[PDB]
Design a protein around this ligand. Structure first.
Ligand code: HEM
Ligand SMILES: Oc1ccc(Cl)cc1
Length: 137
């Protein structure tokens, strides 16, 4: 289930974080508008940049904290607020997060492993509505 998936991801967090984020960047090319330093580089080129590995892992670490604190795939309003108020998120809308989780769910369903894809789909939608309740446009 969802709780075990958190452990699966956390066990190899750096690799999953890179692969899932790359799946998002490749599914949604216009999304590199928020990532000017990643334009014009292949997946393998990105993985060789130190800040790519570091920043994608720190993103997914916080995502796993928010996932772990969730109740029945419903994130805490306080966690959604944190993600709204982060200065690094100043330009974002909930559409950006919706696409991130569409790509993540797609990645899980295409993987070899027994992810509870439906729960992560619900988590993404519940996070989208929580970001909106916490004031994201
Ligand atoms: C639940 C999902 C997300 C979580 C937990 C999260 C968390 C974080 C964290 C912890 C950082 C700081 C990383 C660091 O610089 O060391 C960060 C930075 C950033 N995030 Fe998010 N984030 C999420 C979704 C998104 C999405 C969907 C976008 C855009 C589509 C985005 C855009 C950015 C940008 C532009 C930065 C600053 C530049 C960079 O670090 O590359 N984030 N995020
Ligand atoms: O540096 C990064 C990496 C992944 C994401 Cl979603 C946002 C910022």
């Amino acid at each position: 289930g969802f709780k075990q998936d958190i452990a699966t991801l956390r066990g190899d967090l750096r690799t999953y974080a890179q692969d899932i984020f790359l799946a998002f960047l490749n599914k949604y090319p216009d999304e590199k508008r928020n990532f000017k330093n990643y334009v014009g580089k292949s997946d393998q080129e990105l993985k060789s940049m130190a800040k790519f590995g570091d920043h994608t892992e720190k993103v997914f670490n916080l995502m796993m904290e928010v996932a772990d604190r969730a109740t029945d795939c419903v994130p805490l309003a306080s966690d959604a607020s944190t993600l709204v108020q982060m200065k690094q998120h100043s330009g974002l809308t909930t559409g950006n997060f919706e696409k991130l989780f569409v790509a993540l769910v797609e990645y899980m369903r295409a993987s070899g492993q027994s992810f509870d894809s439906q729960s992560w789909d619900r988590f993404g939608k519940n996070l989208v509505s929580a970001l909106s309740s916490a004031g994201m446009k």
